[PDB]
Amino acid sequence: VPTRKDYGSKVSLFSHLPQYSRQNSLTQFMSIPSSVIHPAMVRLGLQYSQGLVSGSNARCIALLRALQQVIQDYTTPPNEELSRDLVNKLKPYMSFLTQCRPLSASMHNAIKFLNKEITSVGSSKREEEAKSELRAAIDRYVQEKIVLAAQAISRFAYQKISNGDVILVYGCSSLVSRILQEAWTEGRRFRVVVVDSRPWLEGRHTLRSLVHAGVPASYLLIPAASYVLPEVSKVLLGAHALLANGSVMSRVGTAQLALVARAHNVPVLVCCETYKFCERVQTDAFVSNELDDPDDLQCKRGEHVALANWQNHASLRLLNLVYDVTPPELVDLVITELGMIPCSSVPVVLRVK
Amino acid sequence: MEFQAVVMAVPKPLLPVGNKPLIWYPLNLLERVGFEEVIVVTTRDVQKMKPDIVCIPMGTADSLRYIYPKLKTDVLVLSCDLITDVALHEVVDLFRAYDASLAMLMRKRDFIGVDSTGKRLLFMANEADLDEELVIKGSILQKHPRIRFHTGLVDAHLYCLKKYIVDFLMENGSITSIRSELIPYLVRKQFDIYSFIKQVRCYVHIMKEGLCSRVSTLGLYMEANRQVPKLLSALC
Amino acid sequence: GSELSERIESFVETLKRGGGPRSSEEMARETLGLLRQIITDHRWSNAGELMELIRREGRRMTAAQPSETTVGNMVRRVLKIIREEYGRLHGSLHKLLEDFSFHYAQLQSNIIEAINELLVELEGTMENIAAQALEHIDSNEVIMTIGFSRTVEAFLKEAARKRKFHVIVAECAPFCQGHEMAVNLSKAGIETTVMTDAAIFAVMSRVNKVIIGTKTILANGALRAVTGTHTLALAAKHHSTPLIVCAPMFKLSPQFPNEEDSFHKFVAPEEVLPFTEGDILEKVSVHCPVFDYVPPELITLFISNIGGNAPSYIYRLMSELYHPDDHVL
Amino acid sequence: FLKEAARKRKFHVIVAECAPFCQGHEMAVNLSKAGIETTVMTDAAIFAVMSRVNKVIIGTKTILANGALRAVTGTHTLALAAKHHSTPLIVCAPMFKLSPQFPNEEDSFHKFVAPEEVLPFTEGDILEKVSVHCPVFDYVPPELITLFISNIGGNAPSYIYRLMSELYHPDDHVL
Amino acid sequence: PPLQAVLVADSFDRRFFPISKDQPRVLLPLANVALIDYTLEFLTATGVQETFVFCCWKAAQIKEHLLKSKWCRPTSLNVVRIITSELYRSLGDVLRDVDAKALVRSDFLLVYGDVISNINITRALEEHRLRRKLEKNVSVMTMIFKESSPSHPTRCHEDNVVVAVDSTTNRVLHFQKTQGLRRFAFPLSLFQGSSDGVEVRYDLLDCHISICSPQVAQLFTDNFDYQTRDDFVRGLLVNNQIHMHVTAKEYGARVSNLHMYSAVCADVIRRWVYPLTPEANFTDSTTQSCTHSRHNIYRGPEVSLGHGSILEENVLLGSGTVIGSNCFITNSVIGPGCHIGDNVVLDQTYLWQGVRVAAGAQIHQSLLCDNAEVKERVTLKPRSVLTSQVVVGPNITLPEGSVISLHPPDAEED
């Protein structure tokens, strides 16, 4: 499989990160019956590139289901052990998936766990038993780290939400939506304030989900967050990864929201699972981040687009950041299935697993 | 693998379009992009990749059920008369991404209704069945309030089909000539096939630039004979 | 003549319905021209009657659009001019330890002369502000701005002919007006970049300076800027980066943050959430504030036509510009 | 740490010398020998130049128990300037530079050497009246530190206590 | 050519059958302000220079309200003209009379006296004129539609329509309503000439704003059984061409029934019809001034709000209205000169001028007209409308959908 060519001119400060385009997909230069790449992985990469699956846990679940399908469809060759064969065969699939779209922390942790489990299989056991054990381990991992962990975090956050509260959420996170829906079903009577940002505009997902649930909700954009915080009582945020230094790696509009919240004296909370706890460290979003398609910045305002042809100007750059990092000094509490812990206890939980 | 190749030829399939065999163009559409195996259904006189040739002692659906024990994965039906310059990935990406159950390819009396994005297949009907007017349901419009109508497009007779659809063809021996009985039934069903799914969707791809001419008469035969050379100049 | 009345009604209607002049300079010029016209073709003899007439008309124009304070500033400036000219022809703690019913002859001519002098100064303010670009910009510098402002555009493109720097432009979510500014700057070869507001704090660690434009300057040195400037000032104060405000003198209003809720201009929610969403629009409450409040403590300097100054001296500019009795108008 | 990344990245390094023993000159020379575009300056211009700085990387002599350091004289001011400008301050120190003690002590923290480096002996009679002090080290609180890059990976100062529990035994703290 | 419009200040259909007996449909206070005021403001803001106001039902009140209004002043740029007659029975007769008097000259707008919109028509009118100058007497009408969702509360079934238009150049090939019908029929004539850019549109809100031409009135005189606009369009489409113009960043809607009334009211209070809002006071009146506050809470002068009451959402208080203690009001529009009791729950309720509500009343989704009054321990259900000058006794619980009026046979009696 060839290289995923870039698209457009990147920014001077983010010249080391890849910048692609959603219209030009990498499956153009491949056989229709995929021979070198698994069909499941091809479909997964196409869905990731086209933006069909947008979410930390949706991506991890889809990746794990594709891996289960691949293991079911994969037969070990002779004169070689399976414990190393499967890892060596999955390496190019991961390369292709990264070429389609940079992987997230959840996908990295899942792939690491799967490689460890595959390497743990003994050379004497049979093939069918090993495949079944891997599929069962994958399913139990999904059940424990995603569904049961979400239920434990919602059960822990139900005590923090009270009647008459004004909670402020940002972006689209299934954990926050589930927490709010369960708190509303348990008898709590509050109102949520949904904050969104361009160009993804994914907060409308949580907005409609809450309206369908029956929770009184509000909607506004992130530049006006300083206008709605004086009336906000709590700020619930979702996290895609938690670094070893306690800093929170999440959607780009989270660090700024936390900063404005502290200025308005509003306690901020963070909900994250233990499998999203990364061991690496980062102090800012410049050295490592992800640059999405720049054509998403174009907007139809009035009757003409001011950025219709931005590549003609060789001096004009288009920056489209995805993730960002927040220091531990702006996070009050972290909710996990283990219990409510402060942000300066992130390494301690990383210790126990 | 992922897809299986089948080229139906149910002389007409041996007409020398461009001084080359007529069945050579579909195989070329299948070749150069994987497809190490192909299954051909032809007459007894029709005979000479790795072709799996079977004889016919009959419609398209009957031939597909006739080769049911052969098929094991999703199918890509091709026609005997098919000369095209399209990239097969353009239709297979639609079949792969949305996990669709039906994917077709057409090129600019048979009325078709496509949604806003231009690839969702919403309505399909022939002029003969309709009495005098065109009836449209309310639910399809409640879900999709905009339906772009095409009448002039041509049917290339190539479809990316699932496996349970073939299982359904095996179950009900009522559908014959899928091009006029199965595709409209599936389009009318997305809004029984529901037993073998273990929601239904149909998608379309429109080129607007190409040689996607399906040979079915003398005029189209001459048109293809005249246009094949600039394409053969690049192909071979 | 009734032509003055027709012009006043048209001005009030155009301000109350939609926006009038796109640039603030044209707005101030149009207000000053209307005021000069009202002074020229009208029956007035004494200063009190003229001042009350101007006060009533200015009150109407302000009630038409309260967020448009450039007109209140011009009305108050004309009132101060009238008072000064009347005192020139008629004759605090240190001070502490007036009728306008005398009718002169050459009061109208000198009032018009003063108004023309104010107009010429209003015209020269842009170059006077843009001339101070090299004193604060350096080579290989990074500058961050938000929105679209003519004053900041001139301040930035006036120094690109002798210095080279990198400009970051943050668009405005409701009305993405920063794209036009970024395009206009890239047309001059300044190596500009466009981004969202969500990545303000994420990118504000490599920034060296911030230059922005405001809509009006309050009395304690605070601003009424476009939505998103409060967060920009907060990020600047967190990283201890100077935040410069390029605003002429006509953007200075003699009021403290007294008011409540009618500070920001709220427009239809169509820009934030479209009408084609569905039935959720009956339950979801959407608000679209155009402006916001920026406290003075987060500001560092004010570059005006008379030179840069600190926010802690803006009160003196107020005392220098307007009269304490014309604050309520 | 600095010269290992110059082979794949290009950056500008500012080096502040130490007033008593100007040891930063050797570091600046060694870095310039590798083509890193280094610069040398005094401590008086630390805050004056710390508005265009993006990151700080320094070395310590020992790490205390609550995450504070005993660094060379001048690091407390550097940390203060970093905290005023909200710039991350990285400390590259191995595990053997970790001591199991809290700032209990008083006055004997810093090592005081002869005043010859600060004020020469050839001044005159004013040396009998003028009292000169020359502290070599200083104390840097943990609140002004951002990260600790060690051989086992970076960590936050709020976890250094655990490293203490992992390294030493509580009965051997007094020695 | 100066832009001229025609205003039909009488809708020859009676759906507001109780309330429209004492007082016209076009003077029903939406947000303390009549609908004809909204329509005139829209016309004056879009660029109209002259209007012709036709009235048949209760025209005296209409005229003497317009004559007090600000549009009839010598300082108004939209000169209005009142033509009154008792023979008019439908829109077709009005257009016939226009043709008989030769009032209009050029492209004129046809709008009802109960249309609330902030749409600008310069673009559509420009398109219309260019199209008319390429086809001199072709292209005769242009219907303005606001693109919406089929789920929106503003889309009522009584006015709901489905169109089959051309996508290359906007042109109406088929137009029909969907009131009480589940499967739509589209004839085959549409696919006759070109057959490539045809599309069905179901996401459209009929603003009842149409850019007509004098030839439209000509055809109205020609066809005697054209009783409305819809019938004009159908009879021209069976056979001149009629086009459209779709808007996506502007608001527009016509109040045809009560359900449409509570939809535009909610939209206007929620600032969806900006600049037209209660805070703006676009009528230049002194007894309609308000102050916009947080949560879209509008308070007028002399509101006399009592301690304990909570305004939670988009409410509109009138001038002179008195609020009691320990109340709960939300999504409700209250008129001037109202007087509330204590422990009064109001949820999506509309009180007009001169209403008094006693203590202990709970009103939800119901409309109180002028001079209404309710005593203690009274509970009203959704859609429980009270007309003018009705009195509801104490300890009464009204059923859902109840309508009270002083005329005996309309629906009930005092």
PDB file of C-alpha atoms in Angstrom, chain A residues 104-254:
ATOM      1  CA  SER A 104      -6.135   7.991  19.266  1.00  0.00           C
ATOM      2  CA  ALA A 105      -4.956   7.059  22.749  1.00  0.00           C
ATOM      3  CA  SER A 106      -7.824   4.589  23.194  1.00  0.00           C
ATOM      4  CA  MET A 107      -6.855   2.761  20.000  1.00  0.00           C
ATOM      5  CA  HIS A 108      -3.198   2.715  21.066  1.00  0.00           C
ATOM      6  CA  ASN A 109      -4.037   1.223  24.471  1.00  0.00           C
ATOM      7  CA  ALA A 110      -6.341  -1.355  22.871  1.00  0.00           C
ATOM      8  CA  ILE A 111      -3.698  -2.381  20.330  1.00  0.00           C
ATOM      9  CA  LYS A 112      -1.096  -2.664  23.098  1.00  0.00           C
ATOM     10  CA  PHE A 113      -3.387  -4.888  25.170  1.00  0.00           C
ATOM     11  CA  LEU A 114      -4.174  -7.055  22.144  1.00  0.00           C
ATOM     12  CA  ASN A 115      -0.493  -7.469  21.247  1.00  0.00           C
ATOM     13  CA  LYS A 116       0.307  -8.430  24.845  1.00  0.00           C
ATOM     14  CA  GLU A 117      -2.507 -10.995  24.867  1.00  0.00           C
ATOM     15  CA  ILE A 118      -1.458 -12.450  21.499  1.00  0.00           C
ATOM     16  CA  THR A 119       2.160 -12.776  22.655  1.00  0.00           C
ATOM     17  CA  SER A 120       0.912 -14.519  25.823  1.00  0.00           C
ATOM     18  CA  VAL A 121      -0.518 -17.438  23.781  1.00  0.00           C
ATOM     19  CA  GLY A 122       1.548 -20.612  24.088  1.00  0.00           C
ATOM     20  CA  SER A 123       2.980 -22.559  21.163  1.00  0.00           C
ATOM     21  CA  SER A 124       1.397 -25.826  22.314  1.00  0.00           C
ATOM     22  CA  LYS A 125      -2.252 -24.763  22.478  1.00  0.00           C
ATOM     23  CA  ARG A 126      -4.359 -25.302  19.387  1.00  0.00           C
ATOM     24  CA  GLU A 127      -5.373 -22.629  16.883  1.00  0.00           C
ATOM     25  CA  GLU A 128      -9.155 -22.693  17.365  1.00  0.00           C
ATOM     26  CA  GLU A 129      -8.860 -22.501  21.159  1.00  0.00           C
ATOM     27  CA  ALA A 130      -6.376 -19.616  20.966  1.00  0.00           C
ATOM     28  CA  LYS A 131      -8.611 -17.709  18.539  1.00  0.00           C
ATOM     29  CA  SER A 132     -11.661 -18.236  20.760  1.00  0.00           C
ATOM     30  CA  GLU A 133      -9.703 -17.138  23.837  1.00  0.00           C
ATOM     31  CA  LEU A 134      -8.547 -13.977  22.065  1.00  0.00           C
ATOM     32  CA  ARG A 135     -12.097 -13.173  20.924  1.00  0.00           C
ATOM     33  CA  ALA A 136     -13.381 -13.732  24.463  1.00  0.00           C
ATOM     34  CA  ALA A 137     -10.618 -11.580  25.950  1.00  0.00           C
ATOM     35  CA  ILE A 138     -11.508  -8.809  23.494  1.00  0.00           C
ATOM     36  CA  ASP A 139     -15.192  -9.001  24.424  1.00  0.00           C
ATOM     37  CA  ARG A 140     -14.498  -9.081  28.176  1.00  0.00           C
ATOM     38  CA  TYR A 141     -12.134  -6.115  27.801  1.00  0.00           C
ATOM     39  CA  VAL A 142     -14.830  -4.161  25.953  1.00  0.00           C
ATOM     40  CA  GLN A 143     -17.358  -5.109  28.647  1.00  0.00           C
ATOM     41  CA  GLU A 144     -15.123  -4.159  31.584  1.00  0.00           C
ATOM     42  CA  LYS A 145     -13.354  -1.020  30.310  1.00  0.00           C
ATOM     43  CA  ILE A 146     -16.173   0.520  28.243  1.00  0.00           C
ATOM     44  CA  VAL A 147     -19.688  -0.486  29.329  1.00  0.00           C
ATOM     45  CA  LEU A 148     -19.145  -1.376  33.009  1.00  0.00           C
ATOM     46  CA  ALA A 149     -16.657   1.465  33.477  1.00  0.00           C
ATOM     47  CA  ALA A 150     -19.205   3.905  32.040  1.00  0.00           C
ATOM     48  CA  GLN A 151     -21.823   2.595  34.468  1.00  0.00           C
ATOM     49  CA  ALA A 152     -19.444   2.974  37.414  1.00  0.00           C
ATOM     50  CA  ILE A 153     -18.494   6.518  36.409  1.00  0.00           C
ATOM     51  CA  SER A 154     -22.176   7.432  36.021  1.00  0.00           C
ATOM     52  CA  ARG A 155     -22.950   5.880  39.415  1.00  0.00           C
ATOM     53  CA  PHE A 156     -20.146   7.944  40.974  1.00  0.00           C
ATOM     54  CA  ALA A 157     -21.116  11.181  39.217  1.00  0.00           C
ATOM     55  CA  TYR A 158     -24.801  10.856  40.182  1.00  0.00           C
ATOM     56  CA  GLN A 159     -23.946  12.027  43.719  1.00  0.00           C
ATOM     57  CA  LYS A 160     -22.208  15.173  42.425  1.00  0.00           C
ATOM     58  CA  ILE A 161     -25.191  16.334  40.347  1.00  0.00           C
ATOM     59  CA  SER A 162     -27.914  17.981  42.444  1.00  0.00           C
ATOM     60  CA  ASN A 163     -31.322  19.521  41.834  1.00  0.00           C
ATOM     61  CA  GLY A 164     -31.290  23.084  40.529  1.00  0.00           C
ATOM     62  CA  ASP A 165     -27.760  22.732  39.151  1.00  0.00           C
ATOM     63  CA  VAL A 166     -26.671  24.259  35.837  1.00  0.00           C
ATOM     64  CA  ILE A 167     -24.194  21.916  34.132  1.00  0.00           C
ATOM     65  CA  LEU A 168     -22.132  23.028  31.129  1.00  0.00           C
ATOM     66  CA  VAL A 169     -20.884  20.426  28.653  1.00  0.00           C
ATOM     67  CA  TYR A 170     -18.750  20.734  25.527  1.00  0.00           C
ATOM     68  CA  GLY A 171     -18.490  18.735  22.321  1.00  0.00           C
ATOM     69  CA  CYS A 172     -19.760  15.174  21.952  1.00  0.00           C
ATOM     70  CA  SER A 173     -18.858  12.582  24.597  1.00  0.00           C
ATOM     71  CA  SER A 174     -20.958   9.474  25.163  1.00  0.00           C
ATOM     72  CA  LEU A 175     -19.870   9.215  28.802  1.00  0.00           C
ATOM     73  CA  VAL A 176     -21.155  12.687  29.707  1.00  0.00           C
ATOM     74  CA  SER A 177     -24.434  12.113  27.858  1.00  0.00           C
ATOM     75  CA  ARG A 178     -24.976   8.780  29.610  1.00  0.00           C
ATOM     76  CA  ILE A 179     -24.164  10.339  32.997  1.00  0.00           C
ATOM     77  CA  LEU A 180     -26.657  13.158  32.440  1.00  0.00           C
ATOM     78  CA  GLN A 181     -29.376  10.821  31.139  1.00  0.00           C
ATOM     79  CA  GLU A 182     -28.976   8.501  34.128  1.00  0.00           C
ATOM     80  CA  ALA A 183     -29.012  11.407  36.577  1.00  0.00           C
ATOM     81  CA  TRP A 184     -32.177  12.760  34.959  1.00  0.00           C
ATOM     82  CA  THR A 185     -33.812   9.322  35.088  1.00  0.00           C
ATOM     83  CA  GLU A 186     -32.835   8.867  38.756  1.00  0.00           C
ATOM     84  CA  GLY A 187     -34.935  11.910  39.733  1.00  0.00           C
ATOM     85  CA  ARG A 188     -32.465  14.811  39.521  1.00  0.00           C
ATOM     86  CA  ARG A 189     -33.950  18.012  38.073  1.00  0.00           C
ATOM     87  CA  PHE A 190     -31.319  20.241  36.453  1.00  0.00           C
ATOM     88  CA  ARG A 191     -30.630  22.002  33.155  1.00  0.00           C
ATOM     89  CA  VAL A 192     -27.662  21.578  30.820  1.00  0.00           C
ATOM     90  CA  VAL A 193     -25.869  24.180  28.697  1.00  0.00           C
ATOM     91  CA  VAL A 194     -24.321  22.781  25.514  1.00  0.00           C
ATOM     92  CA  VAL A 195     -21.283  24.603  24.116  1.00  0.00           C
ATOM     93  CA  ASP A 196     -20.192  23.907  20.538  1.00  0.00           C
ATOM     94  CA  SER A 197     -17.390  24.977  18.217  1.00  0.00           C
ATOM     95  CA  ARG A 198     -16.628  24.956  14.507  1.00  0.00           C
ATOM     96  CA  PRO A 199     -16.186  23.195  12.161  1.00  0.00           C
ATOM     97  CA  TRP A 200     -17.205  19.755  13.458  1.00  0.00           C
ATOM     98  CA  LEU A 201     -20.322  21.063  15.254  1.00  0.00           C
ATOM     99  CA  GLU A 202     -20.663  17.771  17.125  1.00  0.00           C
ATOM    100  CA  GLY A 203     -22.290  19.282  20.222  1.00  0.00           C
ATOM    101  CA  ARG A 204     -25.627  19.132  18.404  1.00  0.00           C
ATOM    102  CA  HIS A 205     -25.466  15.352  18.870  1.00  0.00           C
ATOM    103  CA  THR A 206     -25.539  15.671  22.660  1.00  0.00           C
ATOM    104  CA  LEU A 207     -28.093  18.485  22.364  1.00  0.00           C
ATOM    105  CA  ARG A 208     -30.554  16.326  20.417  1.00  0.00           C
ATOM    106  CA  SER A 209     -29.864  13.294  22.628  1.00  0.00           C
ATOM    107  CA  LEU A 210     -30.713  15.337  25.725  1.00  0.00           C
ATOM    108  CA  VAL A 211     -33.836  16.801  24.113  1.00  0.00           C
ATOM    109  CA  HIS A 212     -34.895  13.242  23.262  1.00  0.00           C
ATOM    110  CA  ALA A 213     -34.226  12.304  26.893  1.00  0.00           C
ATOM    111  CA  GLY A 214     -36.271  15.228  28.239  1.00  0.00           C
ATOM    112  CA  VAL A 215     -33.551  17.307  29.929  1.00  0.00           C
ATOM    113  CA  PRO A 216     -33.906  21.103  29.518  1.00  0.00           C
ATOM    114  CA  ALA A 217     -30.909  22.090  27.408  1.00  0.00           C
ATOM    115  CA  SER A 218     -29.385  25.236  25.936  1.00  0.00           C
ATOM    116  CA  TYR A 219     -27.063  25.709  22.972  1.00  0.00           C
ATOM    117  CA  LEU A 220     -24.360  28.265  22.227  1.00  0.00           C
ATOM    118  CA  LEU A 221     -20.918  28.603  20.672  1.00  0.00           C
ATOM    119  CA  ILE A 222     -17.624  28.595  22.574  1.00  0.00           C
ATOM    120  CA  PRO A 223     -16.644  32.304  22.164  1.00  0.00           C
ATOM    121  CA  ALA A 224     -19.692  33.226  24.257  1.00  0.00           C
ATOM    122  CA  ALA A 225     -18.794  30.793  27.045  1.00  0.00           C
ATOM    123  CA  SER A 226     -17.652  33.734  29.176  1.00  0.00           C
ATOM    124  CA  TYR A 227     -21.197  35.075  28.873  1.00  0.00           C
ATOM    125  CA  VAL A 228     -22.945  31.917  30.078  1.00  0.00           C
ATOM    126  CA  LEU A 229     -20.511  30.808  32.806  1.00  0.00           C
ATOM    127  CA  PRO A 230     -21.731  33.388  35.414  1.00  0.00           C
ATOM    128  CA  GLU A 231     -25.030  31.458  35.489  1.00  0.00           C
ATOM    129  CA  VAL A 232     -23.392  28.016  35.211  1.00  0.00           C
ATOM    130  CA  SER A 233     -22.937  25.964  38.388  1.00  0.00           C
ATOM    131  CA  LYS A 234     -20.905  22.985  37.109  1.00  0.00           C
ATOM    132  CA  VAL A 235     -18.781  22.155  34.065  1.00  0.00           C
ATOM    133  CA  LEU A 236     -18.800  18.529  32.900  1.00  0.00           C
ATOM    134  CA  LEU A 237     -16.134  17.714  30.307  1.00  0.00           C
ATOM    135  CA  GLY A 238     -15.034  14.610  28.450  1.00  0.00           C
ATOM    136  CA  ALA A 239     -11.435  13.481  28.061  1.00  0.00           C
ATOM    137  CA  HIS A 240      -9.876  11.387  25.313  1.00  0.00           C
ATOM    138  CA  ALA A 241      -6.642  10.751  27.230  1.00  0.00           C
ATOM    139  CA  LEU A 242      -4.978  11.564  30.555  1.00  0.00           C
ATOM    140  CA  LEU A 243      -1.202  11.921  30.478  1.00  0.00           C
ATOM    141  CA  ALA A 244       1.132  10.851  33.275  1.00  0.00           C
ATOM    142  CA  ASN A 245       1.637  14.474  34.376  1.00  0.00           C
ATOM    143  CA  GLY A 246      -2.080  14.840  35.108  1.00  0.00           C
ATOM    144  CA  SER A 247      -2.642  17.062  32.067  1.00  0.00           C
ATOM    145  CA  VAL A 248      -5.860  16.313  30.179  1.00  0.00           C
ATOM    146  CA  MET A 249      -5.692  15.632  26.435  1.00  0.00           C
ATOM    147  CA  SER A 250      -9.113  16.203  24.875  1.00  0.00           C
ATOM    148  CA  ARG A 251     -10.906  18.116  22.127  1.00  0.00           C
ATOM    149  CA  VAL A 252      -9.349  21.468  21.249  1.00  0.00           C
ATOM    150  CA  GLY A 253     -12.032  23.560  22.939  1.00  0.00           C
ATOM    151  CA  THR A 254     -11.529  22.136  26.438  1.00  0.00           C
TER     152      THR A 254
END
